[PDB]
Amino acid sequence: MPDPLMYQQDNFVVLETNQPEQFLTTIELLEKLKGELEKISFSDLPLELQKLDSLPAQAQHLIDTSCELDVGAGKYLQWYAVRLEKLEHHHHHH
């Protein structure tokens, strides 16, 4: 069966209500999500996550194919991945 890919871990620009504009990998994003998601009520989160039994799997499916979510306390958590620098072909700063 086909596995996702080798370059699973890219750079996701995660916008936190306290710390905006931050570069972290898929795993680091996962860690943030699974933390807030476990805080989020299991009776409040999407039904797909209620079919999933693993916490990482839930957050992984968010990164897989979902949008942003509210982490509670009035604040929210959104993230976007910068992929294919086809414009100008700009390499990383450092």
Where in the chain are the domains?
11-82
Tell me, which fold does domain 11-82 have in CATH? Eukaryotic RPB6 RNA polymerase subunit (3.90.940)
DSSP-based three-state secondary structure for 77 = strand
Looking at this protein, which amino acid is placed at residue 89? H
Beta carbons of 55 and 38 less than 8 angstroms apart = yes
Beta carbons of 27 and 60 less than 8 angstroms apart = no
> End-to-end alpha-carbon separation of the chain, Å?
36
Residue with tokens 């949008």: 67
Using a 10 angstrom Cβ sphere, with 0-12 exposed, 13-18 middle and 19 or more buried, the burial of residue 92 is exposed
Question: Which pairing describes strands 69-72 and 22-24: parallel, antiparallel, or unpaired?
Answer: unpaired
* 8-state DSSP, 24: E
Looking at this protein, which amino acid is placed at residue 51? K
